[PDB]
Amino acid sequence: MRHYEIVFMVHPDQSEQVPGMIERYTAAITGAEGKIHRLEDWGRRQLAYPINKLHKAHYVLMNVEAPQEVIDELETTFRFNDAVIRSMVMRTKHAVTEASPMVKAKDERRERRDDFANETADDAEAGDSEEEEEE
Amino acid sequence: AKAPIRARKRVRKQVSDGVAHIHASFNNTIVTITDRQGNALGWATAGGSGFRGSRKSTPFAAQVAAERCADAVKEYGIKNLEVMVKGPGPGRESTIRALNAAGFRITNITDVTPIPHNGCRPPKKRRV
Amino acid sequence: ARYFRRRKFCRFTAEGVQEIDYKDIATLKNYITESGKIVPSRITGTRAKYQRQLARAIKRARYLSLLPYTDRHQ
Amino acid sequence: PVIKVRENEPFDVALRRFKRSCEKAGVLAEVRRREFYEKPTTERKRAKASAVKRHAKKLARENARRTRLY
Amino acid sequence: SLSTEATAKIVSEFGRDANDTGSTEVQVALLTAQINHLQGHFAEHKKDHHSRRGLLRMVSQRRKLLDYLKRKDVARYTRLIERLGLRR
Amino acid sequence: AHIEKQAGELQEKLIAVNRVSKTVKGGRIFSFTALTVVGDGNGRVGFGYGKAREVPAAIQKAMEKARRNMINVALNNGTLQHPVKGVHTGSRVFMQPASEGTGIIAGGAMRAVLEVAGVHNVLAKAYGSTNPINVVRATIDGLENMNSPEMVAAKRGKSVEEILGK
Amino acid sequence: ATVSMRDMLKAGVHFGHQTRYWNPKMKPFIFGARNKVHIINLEKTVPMFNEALAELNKIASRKGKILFVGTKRAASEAVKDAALSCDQFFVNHRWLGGMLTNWKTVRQSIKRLKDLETQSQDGTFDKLTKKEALMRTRELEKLENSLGGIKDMGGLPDALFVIDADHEHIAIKEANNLGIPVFAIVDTNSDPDGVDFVIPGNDDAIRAVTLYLGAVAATVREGRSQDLASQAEESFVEAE
RNA sequence: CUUGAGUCUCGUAGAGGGGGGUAGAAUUCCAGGUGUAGCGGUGAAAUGCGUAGAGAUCUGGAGGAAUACCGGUGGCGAAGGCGGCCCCCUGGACGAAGACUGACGCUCAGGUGCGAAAGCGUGGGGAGCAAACAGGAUUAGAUACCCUGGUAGUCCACGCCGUAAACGAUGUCGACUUGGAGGUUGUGCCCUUGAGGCGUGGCUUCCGGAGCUAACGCGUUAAGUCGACCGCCUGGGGAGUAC
RNA sequence: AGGAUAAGUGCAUUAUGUUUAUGUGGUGAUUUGCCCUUCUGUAGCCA
């Protein structure tokens, strides 16, 4: 129907849950006559302050179009998930279906802000493997 | 409002360095030295020789507080210093100058002043 | 000279782009002090459009800890 | 308020009188104000009111030259 | 809110079937769809008085257009008013 | 030192008298203030408030100010050709057309102000503030709403005012 | 005639004068703001001055006793400079009131003034306290500099030439009270109403104050060729 | 008919309404570690808290109101009214082109509908502050002034008669009357050159002209020029009470 | 590694600029309140 730009972040120690869930979420969206207009994972970062303990988190920009009843239920699920810690959703008017240039800011994350471990393989399993899937 | 300057008297750490925490208000200063592992090697305050009224928060009562606490942590065998600052209150500068004049380094003057979100109601029984 | 819009540094004390989206971090800092925190619009004469939309867009980012929230995170 | 970074023409004491502007700017710049939801527009938020006196001070610098007091 | 597929259905069922949304019958039936939409909100809670001002706008105007309409032709009026239901 | 206007006739209408006080700063001095009206016989906007040490020097000051920055104005016959309601600063006064068979009808200093103004037969009731200082504006505002005769036919009456500049 | 508006396509500016909102009633004859301040141009004054340049022709036909009054920080020399001619009198120090309305007292004080001036300049002003005499001399000089306009002139002038509005409020204030027609130079912080003749312009410098009010123009110089059959037969030398 | 008003898709601003979601930090507390005497309050002050180890500080848990600075003279709601940030459901306004209807208009006795706040029934909840009540300080006292403990209250939601400074202070709504600029916003145009300028609308505010006031003040949002139609006043006190 | 527009080095107690007791009612300065004009006129009032 209309586009509601979900961006969300992931706890390190829990990261192994997300590669399975996102693909199930893409199947919930497209199974409701919406589209995924992006799904870019940004990598692992240092947070500006702790959120639910630990100083680092992992970033995913999902960018939904979907019927309005369902997008309210995915954002609530993602903020209350057992691996995603927080999410923020912004409005359809005077805004994009695909966001601003974060293209550099993604690489910077992968290059230098990364731990290089299993938890950061999962980030790449969660955005740079698909943009839409049926589960 | 001063800790033990004399030797063997209380438990020592002798780690060459510490961090100080300064709580600056318009009515007091609390200057408290701690270990880099996070344990108090001494404190003082600005009513440590009896300043009261406005005079309790001013640069000169802020300075003597800093001079009482800085003295003691030389028997806990510290030589170097770092500072955390918390409030736009007075003597916030006179206190830094006092730590450095006490024979310590003060290169990192880290503002970490907390933010209340104004969850309380302040005392009023009047027109203003 | 016609349809050379944003060819150059024009408007602002410092030229970031967008004000409502917050997904990039490196073009919002243009309007953020060192304490980790929003520029005070009275003192600066901020460009009002960009400032009004940055008031929601910085909070959304803050709550997603993309930026500091409070001075103790300096 | 002392700020982590240093002022221009710098010395080993950091101070807020040179490179601060948004710190305690409504958090403790308040005096006995209670919890309010519309009273600040006329009590607290005097920006139009306070801008005039500053404008008057920039106005008087021209006007002293124009009378030739200098 | 009011959307393209409700609005098209209304033009299809009410007034002329193309290129008209402005006439008395269909104008009343477009207002009806927003009153229904407002009653959709008013099936979550009932301390909705700041919106109720608006409900009474959309009714008051139906009273204005039903008045005009019944002074033009009693057919469009008696059909419309029964075909858009409302009240017991 | 200014041009003055004159009338070939004397008016010395003293309307008010007052005294100036500072009460501690140099204490209180003997000075008076005064208001005096200078007409023409057909009217003037002439009103003068002045001040000096004593009452005579004070009135003569005030009589001078009643004839500088002022000009005379004129009206034919002892009536006014418009029923209008003159207002000046809360002192509001009324007029309606009348006969010559009535002259003045008024009291105090007002009967003396209206005689020079030419609006004494038309004299109808005053309302709002009617103490001396402002009641006396008859010959000022009541001659700025003025109408005065110049036609030979009532149906040429609006046509005749148009061609006076066209 | 046309030369006076051949020079207004050549100067007319000040690039603003005061405030963001300026004086609204002069807005038609003048250019609006640019980049967070106020700017003015010479361009918006020429359509106004395409007929209105005929009023410099009406103050040159009856020319004998003209007074250039209202001095400012950069306008003072321009009040001296447009009035440099020998029928035309000027001040160089700020004007104050009563110099036209209590003219009685002023003419009694001129009559004192030229006597104590011949005395001071001959050296005849001496006292056994030198301080009391030199201090009277400094203050006598200020009178000479302030009054120099009406001082050497036969009586109240036939026009009054106000160059400034912005601080010299009084010179316009008294001209309305003596009824003497006004010849005005208005700026973008002053209205063109309430004065009888205008140059649209600015109040400072030689941009409007002698660029039409001098020998370079043709309209202050064709008024004066109409004096030569009315009160005189030859007088065109005197005036600029 | 359009010269009034109404309506569709398109776009845009905002704390409107109803219901969901969510983080960090001061006061406060507990615990353990480290650590010793004032801490607090204010005009200055004492009462208060504290050696049963207070104040402060490191680590980790507790909890509820609350959410800066951005935030402005902004904007929204019917007026009072709305303030952390976000979404769902939905209102009402702001712009623009295509398109339609075509006086469907104006006001409003009666009328029904409808709350900032506390008052107030029940449910939720309590860290701080507080009428009362105590005690201090002040003094002719001291209920005012000022502080300290401390409770209902504050704090949430609906609900009962909706109180007020419940306001474009200015009824309702509209037509007409030199502008410029601020705040901040649709959108055409710019070196997009800094909350800007010009083009054309927007609410919203400074400044001042024609006209108006008793003065402040108003001035294109009128307190101007007026329009229709409704409300209300006839000296004060005593009375927004009585009846 | 975006706590890096680095203060836009545009910054200054940052929006209540506050608090340590009071002392009754009226009262000074005038009996010519008068020294500007023809006709249409004036201050007790006139050409």
First to last CA, chain E: 26
Residues G219 and G105 placed together within one structural domain of the fold: no
Minimal CA separation from A64 to chain C, in Å: 15
Half-sphere exposure of D41 (CA within 13 A, CB side): 2
Cα–Cα distance for residue pair B67/B54, rounded to 1 Å: 20
Strand H interface, D 7-66, C-beta < 7 A: 22-27, 35, 37-38, 40-41, 45-49, 51
Rounded to whole angstroms, how far apart are CA atoms F32 and F54?
A: 6
Nucleotides of chain I touched by protein CB (<7 A): 1-18, 28-30, 33-45, 47
Biggest distance spanned by C-alpha atoms of chain G: 66
Same domain for G204 and G178, yes or no, is: yes
Identify which of B66, B72, B71 has the alpha carbon closest to the alpha carbon of residue B12.
Answer: B72
Contact G240, G220 (CB under 8 A): yes
Total number of domains constituting chain G: 2
Rounded CA separation C66/A102 (Å): 13
Range of the domain at G38: 28-95+159-225
Cβ-in-10-Å burial (0-12, 13-18, 19+) of B102 comes to: middle
**G198 part of a folded domain:** yes
Residue of C nearest to A4 (CA): C21
> Based on the domain organization, do G90 and G101 belong to the same domain?
no
Tell me the two tokens of residue F151. Answer: 């036609």
Q: CB-CB: which of B107, B109, B116 is closest to D2? A: B109
Q: Looking at the structure, do residues G66 and G78 belong to the same domain, yes or no?
A: yes
What tokens appear for F94 in the block? 């009324």
Q: Is G237 among the domain residues?
A: no
In a domain, G12, yes or no: no
G86, G175: one domain: yes
Of B44, B39, B89, B38, the C-alpha closest to B64 is B44
Q: Cα-flanking dihedrals φ and ψ of residue D39, to 5°?
A: -55, -40
- Chains D+A touching (3+ CB pairs under 8 Å): no
Find chain C residues with C-beta within 8 A of B112's C-beta.
71-72, 74
Task: Identify the DSSP state of D55.
Answer: H
What 3-state class would DSSP assign to G28?
helix
Exposure b/e, F146-162, CB count within 10 A at least 16 = b: beeeeeeeeeeeeeeee
Question: Cα torsion for G11, G12, G14, G18, to the nearest 10°?
Answer: 180
Task: Specify whether G100 is located in the same domain as G217.
Answer: no
Domain match, G163 and G135 both: no
Resolution (A): 13.5
Q: Is there a single domain that holds both residue G55 and residue G174?
A: yes
**What is the b/e burial string over G6-33, where b = at least 16 CB atoms within 10 angstroms of the residue's CB?**
ebbeebbbbebbbeeebbeebeebbbee
Q: How far is CA B17 from the centre of its chain?
A: 16
Structural contact between residues B77 and B14, judged by C-beta atoms closer than 8 angstroms: yes
Task: Check CB contact under 8 Å for C68 and A47.
Answer: no
Q: Which domain holds residue A62?
A: 1-92
Q: Using alpha carbons, select from G105, G104, G110 the residue that is nearest to residue G146.
A: G110
**DSSP label at F134?**
H
Q: State the chains in contact with E (3 or more Cβ–Cβ pairs under 8 Å).
A: none
CB-nearest partner of B97 from D13, D27, D28 = D13
What does the radius of gyration of chain G's CA atoms come to, in whole angstroms? 20
Q: Provide the residue type at A105 as one letter.
A: A
3-class secondary structure, C29: helix
On whether residue G77 sits in a domain, the answer given is yes
Nearest Cα to G5, choosing from G40, G39, G56?
G56
| Residue D28 contacts C, CB cutoff 8 Å | no
Residue G85 and residue G172 in one domain:
yes
Please report whether residue G61 resides in a domain. Answer: yes
Neighboring chain G residues of F2 at a CB cutoff of 8 Å: 101, 177-178
d(CA F119, CA F106): 12
- The encoded tokens of residue A29 equal 């969206």
Beta bridge partners of G186: G200
> Is G208 within the bounds of a domain?
yes
Q: Is the CB of E2 within 7 Å of strand H?
A: yes
Is G18 a member of any domain?
Answer: no
Q: For residue G211, which of G200, G226, G195 has the smallest C-alpha distance?
A: G200
- Side chain identity at residue B85, one-letter code: V
Phi and psi at residue F7, to the nearest 5°:
-135, -10
Q: Are F93 and F86 in contact (CB under 8 A)?
A: yes
Nucleotide nearest to A106 (CA to C1'): I2
Same domain, G89 and G101: no
Give CA–CA dist D64/A45, Å, rounded. Answer: 58
Q: Count CA atoms closer than 13 A to F74's CA, side-chain side.
A: 5
Instruction: Report how far residue G104's alpha carbon sits from residue E7's, in angstroms, rounded to the nearest whole number.
Output: 88
Contacts of D18 in chain C (CB under 8 A): none
- What count of CB pairs under 8 Å joins B to C? 15
Strands (E), G79-118: 88-90
Distances (CA, A) of G127 to B84, G113, G116, G117: 76, 19, 14, 16
Is the distance from CB of G87 to CB of G231 less than 8 angstroms? no
The Cα B21–Cα B82 span in angstroms is: 9
- How was it solved? cryo-EM
Angstrom distances, CA of residue E18 to CA of C40, E65, E84: 54, 21, 20
SS3 label, residue G136:
helix
Q: What does chain F look like in DSSP terms, one character per residue?
A: -------SS---EEEEEEE---TTTT-----EEEEEE---SS-B--EEEEEESSHHHHHHHHHHHTTSS--B---SSSS-SS----EETTEEEEE----SSS-----TTHHHHHHHHT-STTEEEEEE--SHHHHTTHHHHTTTS------S-TTSHHHHHHTT--
Residue G183 sits in the same domain as residue G64: yes
Conformational region of residue B17, where left means phi above 0, alpha means psi within -120 to 50, and beta covers everything else: beta
Nucleotide nearest to D17 (CA to C1'): I12
